[PDB]
Design a protein around this motif. Structure first.
Motif, mmCIF file in Angstrom:
data_model
loop_
_atom_site.group_PDB
_atom_site.id
_atom_site.type_symbol
_atom_site.label_atom_id
_atom_site.label_comp_id
_atom_site.label_asym_id
_atom_site.label_seq_id
_atom_site.Cartn_x
_atom_site.Cartn_y
_atom_site.Cartn_z
ATOM 1 N N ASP A 47 0.828 -1.192 0.000
ATOM 2 C CA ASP A 47 0.000 0.000 0.000
ATOM 3 C C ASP A 47 0.858 1.235 0.000
ATOM 4 O O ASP A 47 1.397 1.533 1.055
ATOM 5 C CB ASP A 47 -0.943 0.067 1.211
ATOM 6 N N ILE A 48 0.884 1.993 -1.111
ATOM 7 C CA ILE A 48 1.555 3.327 -1.189
ATOM 8 C C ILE A 48 0.719 4.436 -0.551
ATOM 9 O O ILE A 48 -0.465 4.607 -0.927
ATOM 10 C CB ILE A 48 1.797 3.846 -2.632
ATOM 11 N N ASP A 99 -3.657 3.081 -5.420
ATOM 12 C CA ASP A 99 -2.196 3.076 -5.233
ATOM 13 C C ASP A 99 -1.681 1.882 -4.420
ATOM 14 O O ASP A 99 -0.564 1.871 -3.959
ATOM 15 C CB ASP A 99 -1.692 4.440 -4.664
HETATM 16 CA CA LIG Z 1 -2.975 3.936 -0.463
#
Ligand SMILES: [Ca+2]
Ligand SMILES: Nc1ncnc2c1ncn2[C@@H]1O[C@H](COP(=O)(O)CP(=O)(O)OP(=O)(O)O)[C@@H](O)[C@H]1O
Ligand SMILES: Nc1ncnc2c1ncn2[C@@H]1O[C@H](COP(=O)(O)CP(=O)(O)OP(=O)(O)O)[C@@H](O)[C@H]1O
Ligand SMILES: Nc1ncnc2c1ncn2[C@@H]1O[C@H](COP(=O)(O)CP(=O)(O)OP(=O)(O)O)[C@@H](O)[C@H]1O
Ligand SMILES: [Ca+2]
Ligand SMILES: [Ca+2]
Ligand SMILES: [Cl-]
Ligand SMILES: [Cl-]
Ligand SMILES: [Cl-]
Ligand SMILES: [Cl-]
Ligand SMILES: [Cl-]
Ligand SMILES: [Cl-]
Lengths: 464, 464, 464
Positions: A47-48, A99
């Protein structure tokens, strides 16, 4: 006689397969719906943090109306690198969600322990990319154990998702991660090779944080990895060891292509088919997100929940047709099955988008609340400028949505369970009378910058 | 100083030359029309069975409106492989005709015998591709001897075709082939190296069927092939031995490009010139096929028939302009010169397509019947959904039409000589009164699934 | 673990950087305007003769409306080869101007002498390409010494240009060249290694003509070149020695991209962004050229002229906005700063193009005549069919204009200083009354085929 070089042929079937995991590409299961399959594996949920804020900033005047183009470029530059490491380490990217991404190493149960070491080594290399070189962090959750897959849909559309404790765990694990942590589920920790993996424990948590690998004296990672590849069905090898995916070698096969295309949106197939300029699917566009959540008694029990999801799906797709929306993605989101639906995607720009989104949402709410085994329906509706585009690597990428409003709609559905809610843009912009709504108490919500006032869509007739 | 890599430059002239044989690319003959040239060579006529039935099936709902895309993909996957073998074995693909192709090995007369062995070896390798891995067969006819080429046209358009006994023979040979046979013309059999080539004879036929090659003890095919390449003007070699065609090295030359482009349709040049999305020339579209056949006293005699074809061409192109049709291909089709003309190609979609096709056909019939040395005109008119698209290999491909209606129009012109005929779709869909037509006796026709009733276009005034 | 091949990624930032020199790509200077920088270097100005006549000929019927496509193909085939030699010899292409280009070797002052030898060797190799194999010649001018760069513009657009005696000299030198000469400026000749360079002198000129290189006995050009590369900041090397430019390795960086894109026209960014078919920027289109010239007391004095150019630029861009024109290029053109402006570029096709061009030109004339330090304004206006397109190499190319009317507008501004002039097409085609103009005496002009009558745009009110 010459032996001339054979140029790579980017057939349509190969372009299609970029949008799907090996799980589906090489799966060959029944076309019956629902279909359920059971296996074991290790999951990685990457998870970015920081791209929804960057998304908001790329709408600003400094970007000179090339915000979508700049955003996707800088996102894919980073995400491609992460996709490559997953692939090189033998994983299957299952799904992109904004993202974030979810990856799978599917193995026989005896091989979990060793494979966990491989996946940790990968996760620490990905963590690495973020400790170098503007404002983005990465949280990684790992889980291991039993996994079920569900395939659901109709005669022209297919969706899959993964289910079970490992699936719930990997998202739980990822949600605990301080910025740049790699967290193992308790079950992952229990199965891993503890003599190699130095952890620190986590507050009120059985999950653990990885500090580092501490290989024993004789340990050689390349020899170890090579042993592990015995168990990897599709690891590129031999003549194809220079490829990131075996799927790059798929050959035309109309039966297979008919089956695979049912997973991919029509606008994407148009682009694959060179019937539309590439530029046009990357956009910052005003849309309405309808985030539907279905909770069950037991969300790890595929043969119980599978029928209900199929049933819900059949109705959802039919009303979305009417109100002009689309299903972008379906996934398990702790506690339930979530459908991320979008109004205003390429081609489906209508006026009264907002009203439609609301009436659609109420309809879905009403119908799904009566489907057997659906305990609770929650739906969050939010409107704003969102990034819509293809995210990932050339060999493995998917159409997805990123924005503060997507997050908002997801957080609404969780913090205001059992009702249809909407944001202020949707409320103010709808055609609908004010007494169709109720103004809600304000809730402090996680990872949502500011909501503005929120409302419940009460609907047309009174309930008191 | 660096010596950096030189990327391949896909100039427009190179893209143009993909659509033409070496015969034209490197021909440099006069721009006078007609122009005739004479040589010897071996011909190979490769005919795939099963794609017009597949074409019909790819319009069905299961294909989810990606039928054209799926069709062209699976067709080119197969045809590309056949094109490669022809090229690697030193042949020049002259022309694609639907799911068939014609290839030429042009050599000095003393070299025919050896070259026949090369072409047989190739044909048996192509036969091979079909004995592996859904419902398609290949018939191959071979001929050898004298060949004439005719170049005809006007100041903006050029066409070529090959003529003579070898040309007639190669199609005769191919028409006898049981599914997956390689048949040699009687003259080919007479010139070949009979000590190597094991044949079985053919019912009421001097042509023969190839069973296998039976090389003598000392025979080495690679050394033999290498000797043969001495006689091959354009075989890629040396620095270019990694290329399928020398034409891939052509350099910009406006004079040459002006000359070559006259062979290629305007819609294709638009695509070459990146003025149109690629996706759009592959389509399953409703068109009307007008298949014109011109028979002469002696169809092997180029200097007799050449003027007449030029004359016919000048009139045909002028009335097709008026009625909005196009010449897709011209070729010798035993007994005569055939023009395959199309109404409704990219850009020329009109209403009253059908009426126009009929009035055009009658006009051509009337005019060509009076051209000196045209013994008989026959024209077949059929309407339906046909595949229109670029078929072949990246380095050698052409725009063509495939469908049951194309076949129907060709078979009508042969089974109903000396008149203009049409199918029921054309009849019923035309603007025209019923007494402009005559309902015809039904004929059992070869390789046409069902005609439905057929009619003669009698035309506007009575003849009795 | 596999180490799979990494495909080249043609990111948007890399596509942008093809349109800019290293001077800008790797420059990182202030965003203040004007900005001035000072350095030393060797300049090469390469001017192809014969393409404006070819341009005129490619509008003729023989080209079958593919004139633009044929022109750009044959131009780029030649210009690409010249661009490659410049790059391989270590130069930076600064700017394309029609069928000419300007290249820079920026070095420390102690290295000029050696670098001049490198640039001569390059220029003689380029001269070489023209002594082989239809109707084109090349004149090359070389200069060396002090160079200033000016960066000017506003918050969305940037332009640079080079200034000073070396800049004036390189154009002077190039203008003296008999067809296929390489001419050195007097200062270049003074700094070069005269023991190697055999020259013949030039009529009433201190500049000199290069006959040949005459290396001393021990001289090895490759070892010499290698020594010179020590002084070349961006020469591709090591892992990247197979690339023509280091700019091919640029990685996504939104700050850098925001800065670089300000130099590139919006229509080009659209194409980079795959929002438009490539075919469409190569065209032969009817446009109006407005060639503005600003003369100063001292045109080598950057800190004097820089403010004035910025001031002029701000007004020019604002009135061009209003009258719907664009700045194509700005450069020093002996005596002054020239803006080559175009009416009718992709997207800005209006009716009354001609009137607008004239009113715009008068406005610019009026305003610039009062800017402090602008001694004299001259503006030439000409209308006709001009080639508009991307010229150069894949790795280094720019959008430019080529045509007899461009030349005409440039020559008018020089031969009729201090006034706004126009050609007959502009005069006759304008909306404007005849007494807004004055018919001018005819002047024999250099490198302009025929003017037809020329006029002064006197403007709306009388002056006598
Ligand atoms: Ca995220
Ligand atoms: N395209 C998408 N698909 C599925 N879920 C999404 C989504 N976009 C946002 N979400 C949901 O939105 C919620 C907010 O998520 P968080 O993951 O806490 C934001 P973050 O990762 O710290 O930074 P970010 O907003 O820059 O992504 C999560 O519940 C996430 O699953
Ligand atoms: N594009 C095209 N160009 C020229 N001739 C064509 C054509 N399409 C069909 N024909 C003609 O149509 C006729 C029917 O041909 P056959 O070759 O017997 C069909 P087939 O090869 O067994 O299977 P198919 O219909 O799947 O091709 C032939 O006379 C052929 O030349
Ligand atoms: N795109 C462009 N940019 C800048 N200046 C241009 C231009 N096109 C033409 N010019 C100017 O037009 C004038 C005429 O130029 P010359 O260089 O003498 C023509 P040439 O090089 O012999 O042959 P050509 O017309 O085939 O180019 C020069 O002043 C040149 O700078
Ligand atoms: Ca066939
Ligand atoms: Ca020139
Ligand atoms: Cl999933
Ligand atoms: Cl999904
Ligand atoms: Cl032919
Ligand atoms: Cl033809
Ligand atoms: Cl400049
Ligand atoms: Cl400029």
């Amino acid at each position: 006689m010459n032996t001339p070089k054979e140029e790579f042929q980017d057939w349509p079937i190969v372009r299609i397969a970029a949008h799907l995991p090996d799980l589906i590409v090489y799966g060959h299961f029944s076309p019956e719906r629902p279909f359920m399959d059971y296996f074991d594996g290790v999951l990685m949920f990457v998870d970015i943090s920081g791209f929804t804020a960057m998304t908001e900033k790329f709408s600003s005047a400094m970007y000179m109306d090339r915000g979508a183009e700049q955003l996707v470029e800088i996102l894919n530059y980073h995400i491609s690198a992460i996709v490559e490491k997953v692939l090189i380490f033998g994983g299957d990217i299952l799904k992109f969600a904004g993202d974030a991404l979810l990856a799978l190493w599917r193995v026989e149960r005896k091989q979990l322990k060793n494979i966990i070491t491989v996946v940790i080594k990968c996760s620490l290399e990905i963590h690495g990319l973020f400790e170098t070189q503007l404002d983005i962090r990465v949280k990684i959750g790992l889980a291991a154990g039993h996994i079920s897959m569900l395939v659901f849909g109709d005669e022209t559309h297919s969706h899959f998702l993964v289910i079970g404790q490992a699936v719930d765990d990997v998202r739980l694990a990822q949600n605990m991660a301080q910025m740049n942590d790699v967290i193992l589920s308790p079950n992952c920790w229990q199965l891993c090779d503890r003599s190699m993996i130095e952890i620190e424990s986590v507050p009120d948590q059985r999950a653990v944080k990885v500090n580092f690998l501490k290989p024993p004296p004789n340990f050689n990672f390349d020899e170890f990895f090579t042993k592990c590849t015995t168990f990897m069905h599709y690891y590129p090898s031999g003549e194809h060891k220079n490829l990131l995916r075996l799927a790059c070698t798929l050959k035309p096969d109309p039966e297979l292509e008919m089956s695979l295309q049912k997973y991919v949106m029509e606008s994407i197939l148009k682009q694959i088919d060179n019937k539309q300029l590439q530029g046009y699917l990357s956009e910052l566009r005003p849309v309405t997100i309808v985030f539907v959540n279905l909770m069950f008694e037991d969300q790890d029990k595929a043969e119980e929940i599978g029928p209900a999801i199929q049933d819900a799906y059949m109705h959802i797709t039919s009303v979305l047709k009417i109100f002009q929306g689309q299903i972008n993605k379906v996934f398990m989101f702790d506690k339930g099955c979530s459908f991320l639906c979008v109004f205003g995607f390429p081609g489906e720009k209508v006026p009264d988008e907002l009203t439609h989104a609301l009436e659609c949402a109420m309809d879905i709410f009403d119908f799904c609340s009566q489907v057997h085994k659906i305990q609770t329906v929650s739906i969050g509706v939010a409107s704003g400028i969102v990034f819509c585009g293809i995210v990932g690597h050339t060999v493995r990428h998917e159409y997805t949505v990123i924005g503060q409003k997507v997050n908002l709609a997801a957080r609404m559905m969780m913090y205001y369970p059992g009702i249809v809610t909407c944001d202020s843009v949707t409320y103010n912009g709808s055609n609908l009378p004010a007494y169709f709504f109720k103004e809600l108490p304000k809730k402090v919500m996680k990872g949502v910058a500011d909501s503005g006032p929120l409302y419940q869509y009460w609907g047309r007739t009174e309930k008191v």
